[PDB]
UniProtKB/Swiss-Prot annotation:
It comes from the Eukaryota. Interacts with IRS1 and IRS2. Interacts (via bromo domain) with acetylated lysine residues on histone H1.4, histone H3 and H4 (in vitro). The modification Phosphoserine is found at S90. Probable regulator of the insulin and insulin-like growth factor signaling pathways. Stimulates cell proliferation through regulation of cyclin transcription and has an anti-apoptotic activity through AKT1 phosphorylation and activation. Plays a role in the regulation of cell morphology and cytoskeletal organization. It is linked to Chung-Jansen syndrome: An autosomal dominant disorder characterized by developmental delay, intellectual disability, autistic features, anxiety, hypotonia, obesity, and dysmorphic features. The modification Phosphothreonine is found at T44. It is found in: Nucleus. Residues 1-106 form the Bromo domain. This is PH-interacting protein. Expressed in myeloma and epidermoid carcinoma cell lines.
């Protein structure tokens, strides 16, 4: 029922995501010189360094907010992909599955802890 525990759990999951070769395309904000039409398609860029720095700044109030930004990395990949068979999109799908498998207990524990706090 530790309502703060999500933050270190998210730090550790980001560490695992950074060790994962599939996170390579998503570790730093997209280079617009390599993809000059990117901001014509993507309204809100997101990447794992931005998520980590937001977490470390103390600028997430909940793991739901972090989850929303991580999901935006993946929806940005889907939206930008010319093909569902793309290399970088295919890496996003595996990394998303890994992320979702690991974040589910972090969200459940947090929401349980906040319900207990409010009981
Ligand atoms: O440039 C990066 N990533 C930043 C970066 C900078 C330097 C080194 N390594 C990665 N993109 C943009 C393209 N992108 C896509 O999701 C898709 C492209 C094709 C199909 S989807 C995410 C990865």
């Amino acid at each position: 029922y530790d309502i703060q525990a999500w933050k270190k759990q998210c730090e550790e999951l980001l560490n695992l995501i950074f060790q994962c070769e599939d996170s390579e395309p998503f570790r730093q904000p997209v280079d617009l010189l390599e993809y000059p039409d990117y901001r014509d398609i993507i309204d809100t860029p997101m990447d794992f360094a931005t998520v980590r720095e937001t977490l470390e700044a103390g600028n997430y109030e909940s793991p739901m907010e972090l989850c929303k930004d991580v999901r935006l990395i993946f929806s940005n990949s889907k939206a930008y992909t010319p093909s569902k068979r793309s290399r970088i999109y295919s890496m996003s799908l595996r990394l998303s599955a890994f992320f979702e498998e690991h974040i589910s207990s972090v969200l459940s524990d947090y929401k349980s802890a906040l319900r207990f706090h409010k009981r």
